[PDB]
Every structure is written in structure tokens, then in C-alpha cells.
Amino acid sequence: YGYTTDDIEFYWRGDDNAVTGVTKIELPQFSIVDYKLITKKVVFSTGSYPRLSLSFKLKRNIGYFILQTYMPSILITILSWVSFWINYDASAARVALGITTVLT
Amino acid sequence: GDVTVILNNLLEGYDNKLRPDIGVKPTLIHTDMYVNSIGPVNAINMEYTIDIFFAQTWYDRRLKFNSTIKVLRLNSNMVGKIWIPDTFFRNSKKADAHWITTPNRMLRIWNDGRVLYTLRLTIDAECQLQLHNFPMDEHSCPLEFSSYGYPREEIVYQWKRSSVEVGDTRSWRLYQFSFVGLRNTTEVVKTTSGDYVVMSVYFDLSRRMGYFTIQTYIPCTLIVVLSWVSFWINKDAVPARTSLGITTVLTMTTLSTIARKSLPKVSYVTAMDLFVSVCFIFVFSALVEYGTLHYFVSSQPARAAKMDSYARIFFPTAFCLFNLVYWVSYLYL
Amino acid sequence: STGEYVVMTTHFHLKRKIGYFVIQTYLPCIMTVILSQVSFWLNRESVPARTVFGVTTVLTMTTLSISARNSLPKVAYATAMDWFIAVCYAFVFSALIEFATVNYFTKSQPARAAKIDRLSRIAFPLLFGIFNLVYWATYLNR
Ligand SMILES: *[C@@H]1O[C@H](CO)[C@@H](O[C@@H]2O[C@H](CO)[C@@H](O[C@@H]3O[C@H](CO[C@H]4O[C@H](CO[C@H]5O[C@H](CO)[C@@H](O)[C@H](O)[C@@H]5O[C@H]5O[C@H](CO)[C@@H](O)[C@H](O)[C@@H]5O)[C@@H](O)[C@H](O[C@H]5O[C@H](CO)[C@@H](O)[C@H](O)[C@@H]5O)[C@@H]4O)[C@@H](O)[C@H](O[C@H]4O[C@H](CO)[C@@H](O)[C@H](O)[C@@H]4O[C@H]4O[C@H](CO)[C@@H](O)[C@H](O)[C@@H]4O[C@H]4O[C@H](CO)[C@@H](O)[C@H](O)[C@@H]4O)[C@@H]3O)[C@H](O)[C@H]2NC(C)=O)[C@H](O)[C@H]1NC(C)=O
Ligand SMILES: CCCCCCCCCCCCCCCCCCCC(=O)O[C@H](COC(=O)CCCCCCCCCCCCCC)COP(=O)(O)OCCN
Numbered sequence: 001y002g003y004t005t006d007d008i009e010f011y012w013r014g015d016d017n018a019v020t021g022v023t024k025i026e027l028p029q030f031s032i033v034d035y036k037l038i039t040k041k042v043v044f045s046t047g048s049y050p051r052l053s054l055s056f057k058l059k060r061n062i063g064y065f066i067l068q069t070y071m072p073s074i075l076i077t078i079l080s081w082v083s084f085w086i087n088y089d090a091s092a093a094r095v096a097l098g099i100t101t102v103l104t
Numbered sequence: 105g106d107v108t109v110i111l112n113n114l115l116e117g118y119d120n121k122l123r124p125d126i127g128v129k130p131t132l133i134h135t136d137m138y139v140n141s142i143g144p145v146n147a148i149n150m151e152y153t154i155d156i157f158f159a160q161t162w163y164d165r166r167l168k169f170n171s172t173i174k175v176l177r178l179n180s181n182m183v184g185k186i187w188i189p190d191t192f193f194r195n196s197k198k199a200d201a202h203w204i205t206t207p208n209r210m211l212r213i214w215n216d217g218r219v220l221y222t223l224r225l226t227i228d229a230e231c232q233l234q235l236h237n238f239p240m241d242e243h244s245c246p247l248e249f250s251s252y253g254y255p256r257e258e259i260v261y262q263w264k265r266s267s268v269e270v271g272d273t274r275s276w277r278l279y280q281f282s283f284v285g286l287r288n289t290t291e292v293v294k295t296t297s298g299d300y301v302v303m304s305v306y307f308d309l310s311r312r313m314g315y316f317t318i319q320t321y322i323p324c325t326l327i328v329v330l331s332w333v334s335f336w337i338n339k340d341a342v343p344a345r346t347s348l349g350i351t352t353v354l355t356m357t358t359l360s361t362i363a364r365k366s367l368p369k370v371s372y373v374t375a376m377d378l379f380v381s382v383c384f385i386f387v388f389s390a391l392v393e394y395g396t397l398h399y400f401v402s403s404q405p406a407r408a409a410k411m412d413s414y415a416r417i418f419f420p421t422a423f424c425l426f427n428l429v430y431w432v433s434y435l436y437l
Numbered sequence: 438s439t440g441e442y443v444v445m446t447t448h449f450h451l452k453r454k455i456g457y458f459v460i461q462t463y464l465p466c467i468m469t470v471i472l473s474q475v476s477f478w479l480n481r482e483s484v485p486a487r488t489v490f491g492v493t494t495v496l497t498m499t500t501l502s503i504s505a506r507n508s509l510p511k512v513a514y515a516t517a518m519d520w521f522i523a524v525c526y527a528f529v530f531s532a533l534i535e536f537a538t539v540n541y542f543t544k545s546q547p548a549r550a551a552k553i554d555r556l557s558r559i560a561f562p563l564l565f566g567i568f569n570l571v572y573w574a575t576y577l578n579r
């Protein structure tokens with residue numbers, strides 16, 4: 001914050017072992033694909049300051065979503081399709097099915 | 105009187121930045137605890153609250169006096185003037201001491217330099233619960249602590265024989281679980297700074313069934329038998345049976361949503377969502393069965409007449425079998 | 438482990454007010470049970486009506502149990518409200534089972550069907566009243 005690039009210099013110690021403990025991180029929903037360590041300088045109205053960046057790339061898991069909100073949609077659409085086997089004489093059943101599926 | 109003179113002579117030429125025996129040998133610290141209450145174990149955040157009375161005792165040859173009084177008993181007004189080890193809990197999400205009305209601390213300096221330092225803590229420790237076998241799951245998840253800046257060559261911790269002593273175990277907020285035991289452990293870990301002596305206390309929790317038994321299991325089995333009730337209504341009344349099936353499916357999916365909303369987002373299949381999925385399948389199979397029955401009535405009536413009585417026996421037997429299998433398997437696993 | 442300490446204790450005795458739980462659980466449960474027993478006075482020819490009655494009352498009781506269990510802590514035993522909701526669920530399920538039995542005996546032994554229907558028009562309300570009296574008496578005396 002206070003010291004510009006002619007007063008302080010940031011660098012990672014090792015440049016690849018500076019950040020450890022990533023492979024041990026378990027997330028309930030995501031999965032750490034990789035992580036990058038960047039060293040650069042930013043320029044503000046008051047000076048040029050050093051900067052490091054630790055950038056993770058989280059990839060989201062899909063199992064929970066399939067079991068939670070994709071399967072019910074497919075089963076409700078199939079429950080809508082069953083109305084095609086019902087004969088056209090029953091007007092209170094096919095309506096029922098279709099309306100209920102729409103609501104769901 | 106003369107205790108003021110002793111306290112003044114102990115703090116004359118005293119540097120509270122240098123551990124006792126800074127360049128001789130590591131400082132042996134004996135740690136004890138007193139678990140007041142193990143707070144609620146919420147699985148959503150994979151954490152659990154605990155309230156303890158952390159006691160640390162070590163030897164300080166600089167706080168060594170020679171008078172008639174054997175022990176100096178002091179409040180938290182002299183804790184910030186002597187050396188105090190920087191013990192921190194390595195798996196605590198958020199923890200804090202108590203300050204009402206006066207900082208809850210105690211300092212007892214014996215005659216030969218032996219110091220006892222006790223404080224009250226409320227630690228929100230972290231433990232990644234493996235939410236398989238849910239809700240028939242058992243966990244054993246720890247509370248780890250070690251020095252922060254002093255490696256193994258400077259600070260060595262060591263349990264006492266009767267170190268960890270739980271309280272009454274009855275007025276605790278362990279709702280869904282049940283305390284079954286504990287065990288202490290000492291190891292050495294490697295860090296970018298050095299080698300540290302890490303102590304651990306493992307608490308064994310067993311999830312008692314109940315809330316889930318009455319929140320999801322009974323509702324879903326009662327929905328299954330509700331879906332079976334349709335097998336006895338006459339096959340000519342189409343709208344009644346279609347309404348039965350579709351509303352039963354709707355309630356089933358609502359109950360599955362709630363049951364999964366109980367525990368956090370996990371990408372694997374537990375033992376509860378498996379149950380609600382089997383129940384869903386049952387209801388869907390009863391509905392497609394009635395659909396095929398109604399479709400075959402137009403083609404061949406005797407086929408449907410036999411199919412109805414076949415299903416009336418085939419469904420409850422398959423459900424009893426499923427239950428038996430499921431329950432026995434998980435209770436043995 | 439350190440010594441003997443003097444401890445001053447102060448208990449504040451409390452007593453829960455049942456008005457809100459009455460209004461939001463016991464009235465909906467009782468009204469659902471009544472709406473369910475209404476399905477006995479409908480004629481035996483209207484099957485879809487009684488089926489709707491039964492199914493919707495069972496669903497209402499399920500959602501009522503769910504909404505009633507949310508207010509409390511996640512406790513691992515059964516409360517009094519839990520017993521009341523269980524008994525009301527049993528009553529609605531028994532009404533549905535009776536309708537199913539009547540429909541099963543209809544068109545084959547309609548005398549027996551009409552007999553059990555006219556008997557269930559009196560057996561359910563008296564049993565529910567007796568259960569209400571027993572429950573309220575044994576739980577308000579304490
Ligand atoms: C970013 O900014 C943040 C905000 O500025 C900043 O947070 C602040 O950090 C500082 C330092 O870390 C904190 O200051 C210290 O706080 C310690 C305890 O903190 C707890 O309590 C405070 C409230 O403090 C009141 O209550 C205590 C306990 O009663 C009193 O001791 C205090 O004096 C104070 O009392 C006044 O206020 C009361 C009303 O509350 C009145 O009733 C009372 O009459 C007084 O008027 C809480 O706010 C804290 O919560 C925060 O911190 C926790 C930490 O875990 C967080 O979890 C939480 O979320 C909050 O963030 C916490 O609960 C004090 O003990 C400490 O003072 C001692 O240490 C200093 C330094 O060593 C000494 O100089 C000082 O003299 C004190 O030592 C004396 O007392 C101790 C008692 O243990 C003795 O052992 C010791 O020997 C010494 O006694 C000697 O001297 C005495 C005179 O001093 C004498 O009487 C004795 O006889 C003897 O001779 C210090 O005040 C500050 O609270 C934080 N503020 C906030 C809002 O968090 C943060 O760090 C910054 N971040 C970074 C990266 O920099
Ligand atoms: C103080 C009260 C506390 C009790 C607690 C719960 C009680 C539930 C509500 C009452 C149950 C039934 C009410 C009295 C019986 C009705 C009277 C006429 C019926 C009858 O004749 O009996 C047969 C059964 O019908 C029927 O009535 C069939 C339904 C009866 C039981 C069905 C099983 C449902 C299970 C409920 C639990 C499920 C979920 C619970 C969480 C009809 O036919 P029949 O030919 O045999 O009659 C032989 C004569 N012809």
C-alpha cells in the first residue's frame with residue numbers, strides 16, 4: 001500500500017513451492033483444477049506498486065445437480081408423456097396429467 | 105505487604121520476549137483440559153463448537169522466589185508481564201476467549217518457578233465429516249493445537265495422565281449425535297518454518313437416529329403405501345387413479361428435496377437420498393403400471409385383470425424385501 | 438481440579454404459551470381431519486371426489502407434519518405435538534383405507550359397503566373426540 005516499486009519488491013520464495021497445501025484442499029462442491037502464481041506491477045495515480053496474485057481455477061461438480069434438479073425434470077416430462085397412451089375420451093385425466101406437470 | 109515486594113522482585117530484570125531456557129533446552133509444557141460442553145455439530149459447515157478450560161503449566165526459573173508463602177495466586181492482571189506460550193488450535197475456524205466480567209484467566213506461580221496458566225475458550229473446530237451412511241454414520245473428529253512460532257526444538261507439549269476430563273455429558277447441545285469417548289495423541293508435523301509438536305484430542309460422535317427417522321423415513325414409507333392404495337380402486341375410474349399417482353409423485357419429489365436440503369451439497373450418493381430415490385422409483389412404477397393396465401384394458405381385459413392382482417402382491421413384497429436388505433446392510437456396515 | 442469454588446445460581450422459571458402452536462398446527466390438523474371425514478357422506482358413485490378428498494388430506498397432513506417439525510430444534514425424540522400429528526395422520530389414512538375398502542366391495546356386495554360406510558360416519562368422529570379429550574386432559578394437567 002504505502003511503498004511504491006522503488007521502495008519494496010515482492011517475489012515468491014521458490015516461485016513454485018511458495019504456495020503449498022492446495023492438493024489437500026477438499027471442497028464439498030468444487031474441485032481445484034490448478035493454481036497460478038503471478039508477479040506484476042500495478043499503476044495508480046500515486047505510483048507503480050508491486051503485486052502478486054494467487055489464482056485458483058475451481059471446477060464445479062455435477063453429481064449433486066443431476067440427482068437434485070435434472071432427474072426430476074426428466075421424470076416429470078415422462079409423466080407428461082404417459083398422457084398419450086390414455087384414450088382421448090377421458091378429458092379429465094389427460095388434462096389432470098398435463099396441468100400437474102406444467103405446475104411442477 | 106510482602107507479596108508486593110516478591111512480585112516486584114520477580115519483574116525486575118524480566119524480559120517477557122524470551123522463553124525460559126532460551127538457549128539451553130526446549131520448554132516442556134503440560135496441557136490439561138476440561139470440556140464443558142460440545143456444541144452443535146452442524147454438518148452443513150463441517151464444524152463443531154466446543155467449550156473448554158485450557159490449562160498450561162511449565163517451569164520458569166526466573167519466577168523463582170524464596171519466602172514463607174508457597175504459591176502466588178493471581179488474576180489476569182499479571183498474565184501480560186511474564187512469558188506465555190503461543191498455543192493455537194490448528195483446526196479452529198473461529199475461537200475466542202471470554203472477557204466478562206474480567207478476562208477469564210488464572211495465573212499461579214509456585215515457589216520453584218512452576219507456573220500454571222488457565223483460560224476459558226470457545227472453539228469452533230473444523231472436521232470434514234464423511235457424509236456416507238447418512239444418517240447411520242459415526243465420526244471421530246479432532247481438536248489439534250500446537251505452538252505457532254516455536255518449533256520442536258524450543259517448545260514441547262506433553263499430556264498429563266488425567267489430562268482431558270469431560271463434564272456431565274447430559275447438558276450438552278449434542279442433539280443428533282452422542283458422545284462415546286475420546287483419546288489424546290501427540291505427533292510431529294513439518295511446516296515451512298520448522299518441525300512442530302502437534303497435540304490432538306479426538307472426540308468420538310455417533311449419530312443417534314430419531315429426527316431423520318420421523319422427518320423423512322416415515323413420511324416416505326407412508327407415501328409408498330399411499331401409492332399402493334391405488335391398486336385396489338377399480339380400474340374404470342381413471343381420473344381418481346391418475347390423480348393418486350401424480351400427486352403422490354409430487355409429494356415424493358418435495359420430500360426428497362427437503363431431505364437433501366437437510367445436509368450440505370455433496371456430489372456423492374448417501375444412504376438417505378438412496379432411500380428416497382427407491383421410494384420415488386416405487387411410486388413411478390405403480391403409476392406406469394396403472395398406465396399400462398389402462399392401455400391394455402382396451403386391448404385385452406383379462407391381461408389387466410390378472411395384472412392388477414399380480415401387482416397387489418408384487419409391490420408390498422418387493423418393498424419389504426428392499427427395506428430388509430437396506431436396513432440390515434447399513435446396520436452391519 | 439484447581440480448587441473449591443463458590444457458585445451462585447439463579448433459575449428463572451418459564452412456561453410456554455400454547456396459543457401460536459394451537460393456531461398454526463392444531464387448528465389446521467383438526468380441520469384437515471374433519472375435511473377428510475367429510476368423504477364419508479358423499480355417495481359411493483362419485484369415486485373421483487372421494488379419491489381427491491383422501492389424497493389431498495394425506496398430502497396436507499404430510500406438509501403439516503413437515504412445517505410443524507421445522508419450528509423445533511433438530512431433536513432426536515418425539516414431542517407431544519408429534520404424537521398429535523401422528524394420530525391425525527393415522528385418522529386421515531384410515532379414512533382413505535375405509536373408502537378404498539368400500540369401493541372394493543361396491544358393485545359386488547353393496548349392502549356390506551353401505552353398512553360399513555354408515556358405520557364409519559359415526560365411528561371416526563367419536564373416536565377423534567375421545568382422542569382429543571384424552572390428549573388435552575393428560576397434557577394440560579401437568
Ligand atoms: C484492526 O483494527 C482492529 C480495531 O482497532 C483491531 O482489533 C483490536 O485489537 C487490539 C489488539 O489486538 C485489541 O486491544 C486489546 O484487547 C485485549 C482484549 O480484547 C478483548 O476485549 C476487547 C474489549 O476490550 C475491553 O475489555 C477488556 C476485558 O475487560 C479490557 O481489558 C479492555 O481494556 C477493554 O476494556 C474497556 O472497554 C470495556 C467495554 O468493552 C469497558 O468495560 C472497560 O472499562 C474499558 O473501558 C474486545 O473488543 C476484543 O474483541 C476483539 O478481539 C477479539 C480477539 O480474539 C476478536 O475475536 C473479536 O472479534 C474482536 O475483534 C476482545 O474480546 C486487551 O486485553 C488488550 O489490552 C491488554 O493488552 C495490551 C497489549 O499487551 C496492554 O497494553 C493493555 O494494558 C492490556 O494489558 C493489561 O491487561 C491485561 C488483561 O489481560 C493484563 O494481562 C496485562 O498484564 C495488562 O495489565 C497491566 O496493565 C493494565 C493497564 O493496561 C493494568 O490495569 C494492570 O493492573 C496491569 O498493570 C488490548 O486492549 C482491541 O480490543 C481490538 N478491537 C476490536 C474492535 O477488535 C485489530 O487488531 C486490527 N488488525 C490488525 C491486523 O492490526
Ligand atoms: C381414540 C381414537 C384413537 C385411534 C388412533 C387412530 C385411529 C384411526 C381412526 C379410526 C380408525 C377407524 C375408525 C373406526 C372404524 C370405522 C367403522 C366402520 C368400518 C368397519 O365396518 O370396519 C371395516 C374397516 O373400515 C375402516 O374403517 C377402514 C379403515 C380403518 C383402519 C385403516 C388403517 C389405516 C392406518 C392408519 C395409520 C397410517 C399412518 C399413521 C401414521 C370396514 O370393512 P369391513 O368389511 O372390515 O367391516 C366389517 C363389517 N362389514
Ligand SMILES: *[C@@H]1O[C@H](CO)[C@@H](O[C@@H]2O[C@H](CO)[C@@H](O)[C@H](O)[C@H]2NC(C)=O)[C@H](O)[C@H]1NC(C)=O
Nearest residue numbers: 262263264265266267268285286287288289290
Ligand atoms: C492421554 O495421554 C496420556 C499420556 O500419553 C496417556 O497415558 C498413557 O496411557 C497408556 C495406556 O493407557 C499407558 O501405557 C501410559 O503409561 C500412559 N502414560 C502416562 C504418561 O501416564 C492416556 O492414555 C491418554 N488418554 C487417552 C488415550 O484417553
